[PDB]
Design a binder for these strands. Structure first.
Ligand code: MG
Ligand code: MG
Ligand code: MG
Lengths: 154, 221, 144, 180
RNA sequence: UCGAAUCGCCACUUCUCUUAUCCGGUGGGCUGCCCGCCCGGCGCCCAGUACCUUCAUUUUCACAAGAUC
RNA sequence: CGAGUAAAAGAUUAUCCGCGCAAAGCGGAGGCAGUCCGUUUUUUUCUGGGUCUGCCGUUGGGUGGCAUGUGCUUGGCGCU
RNA sequence: GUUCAUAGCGACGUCGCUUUUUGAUCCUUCGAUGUCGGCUCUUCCUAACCUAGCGCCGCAGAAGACGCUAAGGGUUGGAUU
RNA sequence: GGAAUGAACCGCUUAGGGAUAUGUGGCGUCAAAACUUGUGGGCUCAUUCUCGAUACGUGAAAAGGGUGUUGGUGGAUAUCCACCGGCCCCGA
RNA sequence: UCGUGACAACGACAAUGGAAGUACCUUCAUUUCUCGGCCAGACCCAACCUCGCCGCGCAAUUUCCUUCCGGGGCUAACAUCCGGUGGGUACUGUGCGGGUUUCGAGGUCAUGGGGUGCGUGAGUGGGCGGAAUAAAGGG
């Protein structure tokens, strides 16, 4: 219903192959569950066959014809600057972040741990002094109930 | 269960108040019966404590007529000379799941009997399980990865009714009450959830300028 | 039914609710330096089991290439007896004396393709009462 | 297998059609109608400017492709019901014993059918209005509902243990016609 | 009386529904493309990224010689 | 000694009750002195008067109800 | 079968099922498995006689033939042997 | 050692023990192995002795039928006819 | 075969039996006690067995690639396809290699050691010593 359509010129990302998490544009369709994928602005990713269970369509499309030249595809990609827009997408940044964590050297892992702890401390300080005025937490709400209850007896 | 005076006295001397073992709670809604039972049985043998809820939402491939006939064939079997010794035909959905798991365990050794003792199998989500923690699912048996869309399937609760189960109305009445209470509570504390979200934001511009950059590099800010 | 008076309890709760801030539980005690595993059983076929080798499933491996990282690592099974017997450093460290006992072993080779390993427990074999219970997989000896 | 099988039907003005997860709602001057199509597994869409309703099946065999026309017929009937309605007329054909039909609000009683003391009773659904004229007329928005009440009425009266070629007494449907 | 095996926890998780489905929701233009709009967390050694600060002879592994209950 | 409620819902079930939706909010609570305990916030207890609402056990006498030998309710005595 | 292969039947041929008959065999039992019928009592099967529900006829009514789902319930007293 | 079970089938043939690798047979649980492998294709829906699924093993099936669905061959016309396969259904 | 005291426990798989551990008992045997025939861990030499990384030969890479035309085809074209023109100079196969003037690691609770230390307790080594510096054998 809301799926992106498989067609010539549609960008895809590979799921589980040797070229995992790589992007290329579909150039042709052969039968129901096979296409030809190519990306001329990136190492590897020459024209090759890919099963349709191993790709996911993206939102970006490029105007080309079926069985187009490699130089024609390269020209089309740079004119629309589609590759840059995908890099700015939140899905691409999440994938890039996970690769950066896998390469970490136990000193950058410590640096990330320090950075997260600093944010958590300051969030705690910000949450308080907004609980003193306009109380929202469980304890600060119950403090108003306790004080009013004790007003009559005391 | 039911601590006697020996247990309460020992806890009083020692100073203990409460204890909770490590337990996994599985929501069995929209799960294939046979595939879920096989995965759970192996985990029981590996030393796990498992509680499964909403056992009336398990699904079986095929039409309701086909599956109802299959149960009526099982019900036909009984020891002719003394039916009170023969096979016992349980009728509740939670009892059917336990019987299915039992047939996938070595049930005539002490090792298998101990493993079967570690499964609870409630119907719906009872009051003592609601606030324990987040529930889990089994992606290998979720029935939207398992069944083709055009194939008819059976819901276990509907099939267990019409063969002897007489608590369908009780279970649906309690489930609807739980949804309203949980929905009302979840709408509450939307202020504290938003306040915490507005605290993590604006925490930046208060942290040192180097820790924010490290957060940006790893895609966390 | 309760403890204390109604007074000095209302004041106690008010004093406790104030001065309260956002404080979390921080783990600053002695650390854990081993991975958690389970004893699946012994090597076997349809004809029966052979108890000189044991099969151990470790958490977060799920792959033969991950199981190859743990070849040669030391493994122990921890249980308790019913009185205090002799132990290592029985005279130098008297605080160690307890009913706790340990049986040690080593990882020889991976088993299958899903990250199970094979373990030999020194000379003897591990008792059959350990099936389904916790096994400690330490990080030494280390090649890294 | 076919890559795509599609069809469409055009609905007139002053009628609004909406779809949400294979649930179709159609609004007209005489009211609204709703149908549950979650058992079909098709791709439904409306244009809302060209005034068309389209159903597409993507990778199907003969069995999967045969439900496109069935779905489109139902939506067409709902549109023809929410505007101009439906109406059925039935006839009582008695040879010797004059059978009598009484209508009391939503209740129908049939007596003296083939000289039988048994009284046949039928309760008509609320969405279908029934009134008496030797003519019994049922009218409503849903064609499926109206047609089913006539079928129930016809099946209430039947001949038993007698030659059905010689004996030809019963209730039959004569005219199907819109309200307006 | 008891020496014991187990070694994350949270009043941000601990509500619901779908998978032919706007996967955060949501409108418009010309039967698929294009254009807009608004909104799990902590925890791993200064209560916090910063100056300061006791760790031993338990002097090379051994159940953490420490915790929870 | 190996701890899982078809139970409740909070200073981690502790630190009071009633109405209310795991709300908004609205109601009730007796003062004094001692001993032994006490790293705090009107600390934790044990007694003696200290004035008692609600109670148990009574006395007769007037009612009154129940199916009528046995229990009650109204109205005063002092009383725990 | 008034004409009409098939309402109902169906020759000449051909394809099966059952183990409730009788044959064929000789596997178990000869330091022994009590050999017919009746009486009493429980249970199972369906290839359906009656009872329930349907279709069809060479089914006007009545009485019947055939076929399907159906084993829940029922199926007698005597003379001679 | 395998075919759940079996004198005779499959593998292999035997001093008392370790390590390594295989044969027949297997890798959803029972039960060791794809923690339900593939980034490989198709076909099949089976309502009352209940679709199908390890040879030997007649340790159960025939003649004859069915556009149920999926493939071929030969003819007319720009859909029709005749015939033959696969899986499933009746015959049972 | 039975009685008594103490103890061990044990559901229902009739018991008995085999293998391998463990928990409690041992009026049993052997060894040690300031060096030990005890228990662990790491290291060395030899041997055997693995993994990484880097390569070679063969017409295997021409029934092929690329340009310019004539058909043909789709949509305005291109492309799939067929004939010609001039250029040509990670690739679906097959047989193998790589540590000593050094190509990087791992394992043996699955092996022998005096673990270079006394005497006949025989380091055989491209690997331990001494000398020399492209020595013959390939592209
Ligand atoms: Mg005898
Ligand atoms: Mg006998
Ligand atoms: Mg397994």
């Amino acid at each position: 219903v809301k799926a992106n359509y498989i067609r010539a010129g549609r960008l895809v990302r590979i799921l589980r192959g040797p070229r995992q998490n790589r992007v290329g544009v579909i150039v042709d369709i052969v039968d129901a569950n096979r296409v030809l994928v190519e990306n001329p602005c990136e190492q590897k990713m020459w024209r090759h066959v890919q099963n349709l269970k191993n790709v996911e369509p993206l939102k970006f499309c490029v105007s080309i014809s079926r069985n187009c030249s490699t130089k024609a595809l390269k020209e089309a990609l740079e004119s629309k600057k589609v590759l840059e827009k995908y890099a700015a997408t939140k899905s691409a940044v999440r994938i890039a972040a996970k690769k950066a964590f896998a390469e970490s050297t136990d000193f950058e892992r410590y640096q990330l741990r320090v950075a997260k702890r600093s944010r958590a401390y300051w969030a705690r300080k910000i949450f308080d002094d907004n609980d003193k005025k306009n109380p929202v937490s469980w304890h600060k709400v119950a403090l108003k109930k306790l004080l009013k209850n004790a007003k009559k007896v005391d | 269960v039911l601590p006697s005076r020996r247990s309460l006295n020992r806890s009083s001397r020692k100073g203990f108040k409460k204890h909770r073992p490590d337990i996994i709670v599985i929501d069995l809604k929209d799960h294939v019966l046979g595939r879920a039972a096989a995965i759970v049985a192996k985990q029981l043998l590996l030393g796990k404590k498992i509680t499964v809820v909403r056992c009336e939402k398990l699904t079986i491939a095929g039409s309701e007529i086909r599956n109802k006939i299959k149960y009526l064939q099982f019900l036909r079997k009984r020891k002719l000379s003394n039916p009170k010794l023969g096979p016992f035909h349980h009728r509740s959905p939670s009892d059917v799941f336990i019987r299915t798991v039992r047939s996938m365990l070595p049930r005539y050794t002490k090792r298998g009997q101990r493993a079967l003792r570690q499964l609870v199998a409630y119907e719906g989500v009872p009051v003592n399980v609601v606030r324990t923690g987040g529930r889990v699912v089994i992606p290998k048996a979720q029935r939207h990865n398992c069944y083709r869309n055009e194939r008819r399937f059976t819901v276990l609760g509907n099939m267990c009714k019409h063969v002897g189960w007489k608590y369908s109305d009780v279970v649906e009445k309690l489930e609807a009450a739980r949804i309203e209470k949980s929905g009302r509570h979840h709408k509450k504390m939307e202020k504290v959830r938003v306040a915490w979200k507005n605290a993590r934001k604006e925490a930046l511009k208060k942290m040192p300028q180097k820790n924010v950059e490290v957060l940006k590099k790893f895609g966390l800010a | 039914k309760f403890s204390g008076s109604v007074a000095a309890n209302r004041s106690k709760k008010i004093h406790q609710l104030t001065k309260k801030t956002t404080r979390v539980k921080r783990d600053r005690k002695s650390p854990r330096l081993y991975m958690k595993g389970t004893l699946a059983g012994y090597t076997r076929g349809l004809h029966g089991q052979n108890k000189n080798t044991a099969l151990v499933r470790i958490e977060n491996v799920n792959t033969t290439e991950d199981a190859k990282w743990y070849v040669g690592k030391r493994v122990c099974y921890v249980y308790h007896g019913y009185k205090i017997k002799r132990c290592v450093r029985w005279s130098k460290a008297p605080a160690r004396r307890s009913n706790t006992r340990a049986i040690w072993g080593r990882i020889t080779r991976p088993h299958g393709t899903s990250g199970t390993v094979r373990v030999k427990f020194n000379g003897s074999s591990v008792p059959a009462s350990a099936i389904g219970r916790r096994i400690r997989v330490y990080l030494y000896p280390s090649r890294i | 297998m076919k890559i795509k099988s599609h069809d469409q039907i055009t609905f007139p003005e002053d009628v609004t059609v909406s779809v949400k997860d294979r649930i179709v709602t159609v609004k007209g001057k005489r009211g609204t109608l709703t149908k549950d199509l979650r058992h079909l597994q098709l791709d439904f869409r409306v244009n809302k400017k060209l005034r068309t309703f389209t159903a597409v099946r993507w990778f199907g065999n003969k069995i999967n492709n045969s439900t496109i026309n069935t779905a489109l017929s139902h939506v067409r009937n709902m549109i023809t019901g929410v505007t101009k309605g439906f109406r059925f007329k039935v006839r009582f054909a008695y040879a010797h014993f004059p059978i009598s039909v009484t209508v009391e609000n939503q209740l129908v009683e049939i007596r003296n059918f083939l000289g039988e003391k048994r009284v046949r009773r039928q309760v008509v659904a609320d969405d279908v209005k029934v009134y008496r004229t030797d003519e019994l007329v049922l009218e409503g928005n849903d064609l499926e509902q109206v047609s089913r009440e006539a079928a129930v009425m016809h099946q209430l009266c039947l001949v038993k243990k007698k030659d059905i070629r010689k004996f030809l007494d019963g209730i039959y449907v004569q005219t199907k016609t819109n309200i307006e």
